[PDB]
Design an enzyme around this catalytic site. Structure first.
Site, short mmCIF file in Angstrom:
data_model
loop_
_atom_site.label_atom_id
_atom_site.label_comp_id
_atom_site.label_asym_id
_atom_site.label_seq_id
_atom_site.Cartn_x
_atom_site.Cartn_y
_atom_site.Cartn_z
N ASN A 116 0.39 5.74 -0.51
CA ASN A 116 -0.53 6.88 -0.61
C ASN A 116 0.32 8.11 -0.48
OD1 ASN A 116 -2.32 9.14 0.35
ND2 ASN A 116 -3.87 7.53 0.45
N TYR A 117 -0.01 9.12 -1.28
CA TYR A 117 0.51 10.45 -1.16
C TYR A 117 -0.62 11.38 -1.50
CZ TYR A 117 4.92 8.15 -0.67
OH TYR A 117 5.88 7.40 -0.17
N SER A 160 -14.26 2.42 -5.75
CA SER A 160 -12.89 2.86 -5.72
C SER A 160 -12.26 2.80 -4.31
CB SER A 160 -12.80 4.24 -6.33
OG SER A 160 -13.32 4.22 -7.65
N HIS A 183 0.85 -1.18 0.00
CA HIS A 183 0.00 0.00 0.00
C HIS A 183 0.88 1.23 0.00
CE1 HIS A 183 -1.63 3.31 2.46
NE2 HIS A 183 -2.62 3.24 1.58
N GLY A 207 -20.89 11.51 -2.35
CA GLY A 207 -20.63 11.30 -3.76
C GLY A 207 -19.47 10.39 -4.15
N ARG A 227 -16.82 7.43 -4.91
CA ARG A 227 -17.09 6.11 -5.46
C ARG A 227 -16.70 4.99 -4.48
NH1 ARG A 227 -14.92 2.74 -9.81
NH2 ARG A 227 -16.69 1.93 -11.10
#
Lengths: 326, 326
Positions: A131-132, A288, A129, A283, A285
Site C-alpha cells: 500500500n502507498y 473492493s 500486501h 459510498g 465499494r
C-alpha cells in the site's frame, strides 16, 4: 475536484504514480500466471471520487489478487476518523454534538492510494500486501491542516523460507537506504507491531516496512521514496513466487495455508485500519475493500502444530519477530 | 467467588440451569449425529472464573459446533465495556485527576452464560446461534449496582425453507407467549436489527429472538422465561436438521454455504458484541470465543446470484426481513 492549489501538484502526481504502478504491477504478476487482471471502475456517489479495481481470480499461480487504486474526497465522517491514521489527534475540533457527545464533526479530506493483496494457490508461495497512499485534511473554513503519506509492503508465508524473507526485506531496505538509512529499522519494527493479531499473540506474517502519518520531508521527496519502494516489490515478489509455485505440496500443507488464511481474515477484519477506513467512508465499494480477503480460509478448534514442525517454526517467528537483512 | 449475598442465589441458579442445558443440548445434538462433544474446562487466570467449553467437530451431521458455558468475574476493563451491553451508560463514572481524565477506571463484574453456534455439514442444514446469560456489576464501594439478562436464538440458512423459519420462530414465540405475548415481536425485530451486516446491507440469516439489557421482571421470573426459551431450541433445530441433514447437494450449493459462512465471519469479527467482550476481557480463552467461526469460509469477488435463483431468494429475506408466524 478538490481544486485547492496549495498542494494540488503532489495530489495529481501521486494519483498518476499509483495508476502507472497499477498497470506495471498487474502486468508483472500476469507474467508468471496464465490469467489476466480484469478492470472495474466505480465512484462513491458523485463528487465523492472513486477508484479502479483490478482483479485476478482462479489463476494457475494466484488464486485471488487485487490491485486497487482509490482517489477519494469530501466530508470526513466521525465514524472513520480513528482509522484514517495512527495518531488521530494532529487534527481535531471540539465541534459540539448538539445533545451529549464531544470531539468530531464537519471536515473535508482527500485520500489517494494503491492497495494490493495477492494470495497464491500453492501453500509454499506466500501472500503479500502493499500500500502507498497520501492523505490531506482541510479546516472547516477551507484552509490547509495537514497532509501525510503512508504505505509499506509485507510478506505472509505459511511455510517459512529464510531466502524469501531476506530478499523481500533487503530490497525494501535497499530502497529506503537510498533516501535515509534510518528509515528501514524504523519502518521494519513498525511493520512488526502493526500486523500483530493482538488476541492471537502473533503477527500474520514476517513483515517488511510500514509507515503512516509520514510528513517528514518535502512531499516531493516522499514521492520519490514511494516510487522506489514500489520498485522493491516485483523483483522480490516475482522471484519468490517463481521458486515456490511449483514446489510439491500436501493436503496438510493446504490445511495450514487455510488456517493462516483464517489468521489473515481475523487481522483484516478486527485490526486493519485501511479496511476500517474504507468500510466507514460513505459510498466506498465493499467488493473492493474486501478484495483483501482470501477466496478460502479455515478455523480449527484449538489447533497446535506438531512440535519441531515447519508450522511451529512459522509460529516461532510470528510470536517473536526476527531480522532478515544484512 | 463472588459471595455477595443479595443476588448470590440467582447467580448460582442461572449457573445450575446453564450447565444442565449444556449437558442436555449437547446430548441432543450428539443424538442426530454419530460423533460426540469434547469437553474442556478452562480458567480465566485465577479468581477470574472460568468456563466449560464443549466442541463437536468432524462428524456426519455437524461440521463444527460449540456449546460454551462460562462463569466469569472480577475487574471490568475499560475496553470490555461498550461490548458488555446494548446500552452501557446505565452504569456511569467520572473521577478527574489533575487537569486529566474523568471517565471510570476500577469497578467489579460477574457474567454467567451459555453460548452456542452450530455449523452443519449440509448446506441445506442451517447454522444456528444461541445465548442465555446473566451479567452483574458492583459499585466502586462494593455495593450492588446492576444485573440484567441477555439472550435468545436465531437461524442462519444458506438455503431458505419457509417451514424451518416458521417452526423456529413459532417455538421461540411460544416460549415467550407464556411470559408476555408482547416480548416476541419486540425481541424478533431486535433480532433482525442486531444481526444486520451494515457494510453488506443484509442480515446474516433469518433471525429469531434476541434481547439484551433485560431486568424488567424479577430475576426469579426471568429465569423461568430463560428456561422456557432454552426448550424452544432443541425441538426446532433438531427437527430442522433431521430433515435437511440428508438433502442432496452440489458443489455449487456448497460454494454458497461457503459464501454465507464468509458473511457470518464478517458479522462475528466486526459487529458481534459477545465476541468483542470475550476478546477484550483479560484471560478469556480465545479458542472458546472463536469457536463460533465456521471450519471453512469463502470470499468471492463481486459475486451475484442469478435472478430468481434460490440463492437470490435468501438475499430477498436477508436484505428485507419478514414474518414467520401467522
Amino acid at each position: 475536484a478538490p481544486q485547492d492549489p496549495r498542494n494540488l501538484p503532489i495530489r495529481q502526481q501521486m494519483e498518476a504514480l499509483i495508476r502507472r504502478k497499477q498497470a506495471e504491477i498487474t502486468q508483472g504478476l500476469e507474467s508468471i500466471d496464465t490469467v489476466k487482471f480484469h478492470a472495474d471502475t466505480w465512484t462513491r456517489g458523485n463528487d465523492g471520487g472513486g477508484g479502479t479495481s483490478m482483479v485476478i481470480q482462479d489463476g494457475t499461480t494466484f488464486e485471488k489478487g487485487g490491485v486497487n487504486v482509490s482517489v477519494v474526497y469530501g466530508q470526513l465522517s466521525p465514524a472513520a476518523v480513528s482509522a484514517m491514521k495512527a495518531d488521530h489527534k494532529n487534527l481535531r475540533l471540539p465541534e459540539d454534538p448538539k445533545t451529549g457527545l464531544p470531539v468530531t464533526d464537519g471536515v473535508k479530506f482527500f485520500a489517494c492510494g494503491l492497495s494490493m493483496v495477492i494470495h497464491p494457490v500453492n501453500p509454499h508461495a506466500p501472500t503479500t500486501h502493499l500500500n502507498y497512499r497520501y492523505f490531506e485534511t482541510w479546516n472547516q473554513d477551507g484552509t490547509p491542516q495537514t497532509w501525510w503519506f503512508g504505505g509499506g509492503a509485507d510478506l505472509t508465508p505459511s511455510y517459512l523460507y529464510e531466502e524469501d524473507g531476506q530478499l523481500f526485506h533487503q530490497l525494501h531496505k535497499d530502497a529506503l537506504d537510498k533516501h535515509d538509512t534510518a528509515l528501514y529499522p524504523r519502518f521494519k519494527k513498525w511493520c512488526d507491531e502493526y500486523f500483530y493479531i493482538t488476541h492471537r499473540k502473533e503477527t500474520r506474517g514476517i513483515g517488511g516496512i510500514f509507515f503512516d502519518d509520514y510528513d517528514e520531508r518535502d512531499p516531493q521527496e516522499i514521492l520519490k521514496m514511494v516510487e522506489d519502494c514500489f520498485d522493491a516489490f516485483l523483483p522480490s515478489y516475482l522471484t519468490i513466487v517463481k521458486r515456490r509455485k511449483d514446489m510439491p505440496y500436501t493436503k496438510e500443507e493446504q490445511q495450514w495455508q487455510a488456517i493462516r488464511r483464517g489468521r489473515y481474515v481475523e487481522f483484516n477484519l478486527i485490526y486493519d485500519r485501511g479496511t476500517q477506513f474504507g468500510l466507514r467512508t460513505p459510498g466506498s465499494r465493499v467488493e473492493s475493500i474486501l478484495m483483501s480477503l482470501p477466496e478460502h480460509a479455515s478455523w480449527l478448534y484449538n489447533h497446535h502444530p506438531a512440535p519441531g514442525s515447519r508450522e511451529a517454526k512459522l509460529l516461532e517467528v510470528t510470536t517473536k519477530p526476527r531480522e532478515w537483512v544484512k
